């Protein structure tokens, strides 16, 4: 019969699970105040209103990028390292790493808050890339992210110092393949003893169908606004769904885990640079 949140907490506590793979989406970054560009309200959205996008996903299409690189660079200025901080949901993942439980964190987010929260690059897979580095679109010359920062904060399109091509951050656009580290899923997912899914809608391949690559006796815990993707329509009976606000889902799990005080103290220290 169906496990509960509490049961999952118990498995971790009894050390019956020691190898947790986590998959995260945009839902875990909302509480850091990161605006959804598709949504009116934010100043990111307003600044986008002047380009008259035919539809918002154009921001992540190459043909539209080479026609006009500024819509996308408005977004990058908004999301570039230093502007936003990790939320509790990030530090809970960090805590999970420092207690020996993290096999691998797969993120679809490009805001960079997982590494900012101090989880090591070797445990992360940024499936949609990162602003930490960039590539010249013409000569394929690689640059660290801070080399084009002055350009991005001043609203100039970054140009290549060798060939003058437009330097693009290593974010995955539509139809581009995921980065090579995404191939870890092949070892990682058969090896997982627990699967944690947080703040995602499972609408972007091939990351979506990943929920399907764990052994059938592996419990899959979803903390998300609703039931969705693989888990809604191919239910396994070790599936668990904490529906509601992601942060209140994480706070309850954290408490059932017995980690509350240690978490508060970790976040105070960490979020200290504010």
Binding residue positions: 25-45, 108-111, 136, 139, 160, 163, 199-201, 224-226
Stretch that binds its own copies, among 75-83, 131-139, 191-199, 218-226 (CB under 8 A): 131-139
Report which DSSP code applies to 115: H
Q: Which residues are annotated binding-site positions for NAD(+)? A: 25-45, 108-111, 199-201, 224-226
Indicate the residue among 65 and 91 with the shorter CB distance to Zn ion: 65
Query: Does residue 136 belong to the site contacting Zn ion (CB under 5 A)?
Result: yes
Query: Diameter of the chain by CA atoms?
Result: 63
Nearest to 102 by CA among 122, 128, 130, 129: 122
Q: Which of 31, 165, 179, 230 binds Zn ion (CB under 5 A)?
A: 165
Residue 137's binding partner, choosing from its own copies, Zn ion, none, with beta-carbon cut-off 5 to 8 A by kind? its own copies
Cis peptide before 206 (omega within 30 of 0): yes
Q: Which of 16, 62, 121, 139 binds Zn ion (CB under 5 A)?
A: 139
**Residues in 162-181 that interact with its own copies by CB under 8 A:** 165-166, 174-175, 177
Query: Does residue 271 belong to the site contacting its own copies (CB under 8 A)?
Result: no
Name the token pair of 230.
Answer: 């693989």
Query: Distance (Å, rounded) from C-alpha 34 to C-alpha 22?
Result: 21
The least distance separating its own copies from the CB of residue 64, rounded to whole angstroms, comes to 8
Query: Distance (Å, rounded) from C-alpha 64 to C-alpha 175?
Result: 13
Q: Which of 121, 163, 186, 243 binds Zn ion (CB under 5 A)?
A: 163
Query: Does residue 63 belong to the site contacting its own copies (CB under 8 A)?
Result: yes
The least distance separating its own copies from the CB of residue 185, rounded to whole angstroms, comes to 14
Query: Does residue 134 belong to the site contacting Zn ion (CB under 5 A)?
Result: no
Strands, DSSP E only, in the chain?
20-24, 102-107, 124-126, 129-136, 142-144, 167-171, 194-198, 220-224, 239-243
Name the token pair of 144.
Answer: 């660290």
The least distance separating its own copies from the CB of residue 177, rounded to whole angstroms, comes to 5
Name the token pair of 197.
Answer: 């899914």
């Amino acid at each position: 019969g169906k496990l509960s949140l509490q049961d999952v907490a118990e498995l971790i506590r009894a050390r019956a699970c020691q190898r947790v793979v986590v998959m995260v989406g945009a839902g875990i970054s909302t509480p850091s105040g990161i605006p959804d560009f598709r949504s009116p309200g934010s100043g990111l959205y307003s600044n986008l209103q002047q380009y008259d996008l035919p539809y918002p996903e154009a921001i992540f299409e190459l043909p539209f990028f080479f026609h006009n690189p500024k819509p996308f660079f408005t977004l990058a200025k908004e999301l570039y390292p230093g502007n936003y901080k990790p939320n509790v949901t990030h530090y809970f993942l960090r805590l999970l790493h420092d207690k020996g439980l993290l096999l691998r964190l797969y993120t679809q987010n490009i805001d960079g808050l997982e590494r900012v929260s101090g989880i090591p690059a070797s445990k992360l897979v940024e499936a949609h890339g990162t602003f930490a580095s960039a590539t010249c679109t013409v000569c394929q010359r690689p640059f660290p992210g801070e080399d084009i920062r002055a350009d991005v904060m001043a609203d100039r399109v970054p140009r290549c110092p060798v060939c003058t091509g437009v330097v693009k951050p290593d974010i995955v656009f539509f139809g581009e393949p995921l980065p090579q580290r995404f191939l870890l899923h092949v070892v990682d997912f058969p090896m997982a003893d627990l699967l944690l899914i947080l703040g995602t809608s499972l609408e972007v391949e091939p990351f979506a169908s990943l929920t399907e690559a764990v052994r059938s006796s592996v419990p899959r815990l979803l903390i998300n606004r609703d039931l969705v993707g693989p888990l809604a329509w191919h239910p396994r009976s070790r599936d668990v769904a904490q529906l509601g606000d992601v942060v209140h889902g994480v706070e309850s799990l954290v408490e059932l885990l017995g980690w509350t005080e240690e978490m508060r103290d970790l976040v105070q220290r960490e979020t200290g640079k504010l």
